């Protein structure tokens, strides 16, 4: 069968969700399905402006009742109404906040699923011990660790934040580090070389593009990142309290309250203030860190992508009769 995913690569994709879904198909139903990201039986939109038009194309031909049209919402809160369309067979929601929002849009209960934000199946294989993961990455085994990243392209004031962290997580009365940093620069090669060439006074590992994010996050105790939905969902599955340091205008604004309101992290654009929060969490406010970690795990939706595609399967199995 033919699976057609569509998405605006013009930055906001969401690529991460599209590939995660494709990965889900291949791993679950094998060659039974054949998927393409961008003659389809099922059609998936992971974008807030590829609903109406792509739908009118199926209404003004009558190919609607033929092929299924779903939607995987990627904002986590305070969405843009354009995700919601009555002519949608199913609208997958990453949270109750959004589901209850879809209800207001007038989407019937049979049109709404709340499985969570789809994360790579390759991510969701379960936890390895923290000591082992750290050893594999060349990190110190015992020091609490903050993961610092900025999506696939390594955006954000990463260097300034790393510097602030280096000064903030060094105890000058024992003359040693009380914390450590794992930096993932993604595809930002320029940043990777800059950071790698500097001497850091606490343990700092600089990586480029990571494919086994699950392990990197598993090695750490909290995370600093821009408010990307994919990273947020991944961090919560790994019980990582989140310090959001900013967001891409329009695309990622609604994700901030989802983290803060649910007790899963904090927001701050100041490298210095961020480093203060981490030193606090790694020191006198460790209790708070654990509580936020627990909050994150309770909201984590590791099986999201599986439930979504299976529901997509049971859908095509019944539209072709
Ligand atoms: O070195 C890297 C950097 C990023 N990512 C992945 O890239 C995705 C980024 O998605 P997000 O929604 O957080 O950022 P956006 O797609 O909006 O740029 C996440 O799933 C990360 O796990 C990765 O696998 N390795």
Between the CA of 136 and the centroid of ligand 1 the distance, in Å, is 21
Which one, of 262, 211, 216, lies nearest residue 235 by Cα?
216
The secondary structure of residue 8, as a DSSP letter, is B
Asked if residues 264 and 288 have their Cβ atoms less than 8 Å apart, the reply is no
Burial-class residue 258 by CB neighbours within 10 Å (0-12, 13-18, 19+): buried
Q: Is the dihedral of CA 58, 95, 219, 225 positive or negative?
A: positive
Between the CA of 110 and the centroid of ligand 1 the distance, in Å, is 31
Method: X-ray
Strands 222-225, 145-149: pairing is: parallel
| Chain-centroid distance, C-alpha 147 | 14
Question: What is the distance between the alpha carbons of residues 112 and 98, in angstroms, rounded to a whole number?
Answer: 10
Question: What is the distance between the alpha carbons of residues 62 and 243, in angstroms, rounded to a whole number?
Answer: 48
Q: Is the dihedral of CA 90, 2, 48, 304 positive or negative?
A: positive
- Structure-block tokens of residue 275: 């480093």
Cα 155 to Cα 183, 187, 199, 217, 290, distances in angstroms: 12, 10, 22, 18, 28
Question: What is the distance between the alpha carbons of residues 104 and 84, in angstroms, rounded to a whole number?
Answer: 10
Phi-psi map region of 183: left, alpha, beta (phi>0 left; psi -120 to 50 alpha): beta
Report the 10 Å Cβ neighbour count for 53.
Answer: 8
260 lines ligand 1 (CB under 6 A): no
Nearest-CA residue for atom 25 of ligand 1: 210
Taking each continuous run of H as one helix and of E as one strand, the counts in the chain are 12, 14
Give 170's contacts (C-beta < 8 A, 6+ positions apart). Answer: 176, 177, 178, 201, 202
Asked if residues 203 and 226 have their Cβ atoms less than 8 Å apart, the reply is no
For a ligand 1 pocket test, name from 156, 207, 213, 227 the mutation site with the most ligand atoms within 8 angstroms of its C-beta.
Answer: 213
Strands 176-177, 170-171: pairing is: antiparallel
Asked if residues 10 and 43 have their Cβ atoms less than 8 Å apart, the reply is no
254 lines ligand 1 (CB under 6 A): no
Cα 52 to Cα 30, 32, 45, 87, 235, distances in angstroms: 31, 29, 11, 9, 32
Question: What is the distance between the alpha carbons of residues 196 and 134, in angstroms, rounded to a whole number?
Answer: 18
| Resolution given for this structure, in angstroms | 2.2
Question: What is the distance between the alpha carbons of residues 157 and 143, in angstroms, rounded to a whole number?
Answer: 24
Partners of residue 87 on adjacent β-strands: none
Structure-token match 């959004």, residue found: 98
Report the 10 Å Cβ neighbour count for 125.
Answer: 12
Asked if residues 186 and 152 have their Cβ atoms less than 8 Å apart, the reply is yes
Which one, of 303, 234, 294, lies nearest residue 264 by Cα?
294
Nearest-CA residue for atom 15 of ligand 1: 228
- Edge to edge, the sheet with strand 112-113 lists 34-37, 2-6, 42-45, 68-72, 90-92, 112-113
Asked if residues 206 and 181 have their Cβ atoms less than 8 Å apart, the reply is no
Cα 158 to Cα 102, 108, 186, distances in angstroms: 36, 44, 12
Question: What is the distance between the alpha carbons of residues 83 and 114, in angstroms, rounded to a whole number?
Answer: 14
Question: What is the distance between the alpha carbons of residues 114 and 98, in angstroms, rounded to a whole number?
Answer: 9
- Structure-block tokens of residue 102: 């879809």
Phi-psi map region of 13: left, alpha, beta (phi>0 left; psi -120 to 50 alpha): left
- 313 known member of a binding site: no
DSSP assignment of 114-138, as one string? ---S---TTT-S-PPPHHHHHHHHT
What's the full length of the chain, in residues? 321
- Structure-block tokens of residue 221: 């105790």
Burial-class residue 256 by CB neighbours within 10 Å (0-12, 13-18, 19+): buried
Per DSSP, the three-state class of 205 is strand
Partners of residue 170 on adjacent β-strands: 177
- 209 known member of a binding site: yes
Between the CA of 295 and the centroid of ligand 1 the distance, in Å, is 22
184 lines ligand 1 (CB under 6 A): yes
- Domains (ranges, CATH) in the chain? 2-121+302-316 (3.40.50), 130-299 (3.40.50.2000)
């Amino acid at each position: 069968k033919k699976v057609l995913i569509l998405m605006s690569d013009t930055g906001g994709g969401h690529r991460a969700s599209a590939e995660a879904i494709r990965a889900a198909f291949n791993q679950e139903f094998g060659d039974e399905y054949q998927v393409f990201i961008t003659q389809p039986d099922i059609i998936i939109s992971v974008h807030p402006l590829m609903q109406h038009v792509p739908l009118r194309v199926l209404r003004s031909k009558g190919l609607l009742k033929k092929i299924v049209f779903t939607t995987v919402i990627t904002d986590l809160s305070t969405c843009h109404p354009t995700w919601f369309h009555k002519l949608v067979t199913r609208c997958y929601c990453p949270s109750t906040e959004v589901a209850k929002r879809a209800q207001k849009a007038g989407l019937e209960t049979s049109q709404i699923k709340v499985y969570g934000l789809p994360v790579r199946p390759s991510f969701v294989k379960p936890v390895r011990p923290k000591v082992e993961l750290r050893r594999e990455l060349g990190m110190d085994e015992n020091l609490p660790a903050v993961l610092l990243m900025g999506g696939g392209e390594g955006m954000g004031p990463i260097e300034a934040t790393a510097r602030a962290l280096a000064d903030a997580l060094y105890d000058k009365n024992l003359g040693e580090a009380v914390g450590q940093v794992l930096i993932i620069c993604g595809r930002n090669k320029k940043l990777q070389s800059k950071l790698s060439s500097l001497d850091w006074k606490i343990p700092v590992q600089v990586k480029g593009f990571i494919t086994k994010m699950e392990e990197c996050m598993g090695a750490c105790d909290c995370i600093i990142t821009k408010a990307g939905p994919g990273t947020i969902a991944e961090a919560m599955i790994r019980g990582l309290p989140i310090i959001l340091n900013g967001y891409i205008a329009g695309q990622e604004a609604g994700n901030v309250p989802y983290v803060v309101e649910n007790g899963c992290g904090k927001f701050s654009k100041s490298p210095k203030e961020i480093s203060k929060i981490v030193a606090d969490w790694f020191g006198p406010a460790s209790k708070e860190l654990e509580i936020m970690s627990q909050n994150a795990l309770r909201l984590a939706k590791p099986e999201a992508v599986f439930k979504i595609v299976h529901d997509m399967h049971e859908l095509v199995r019944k539209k072709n009769s």
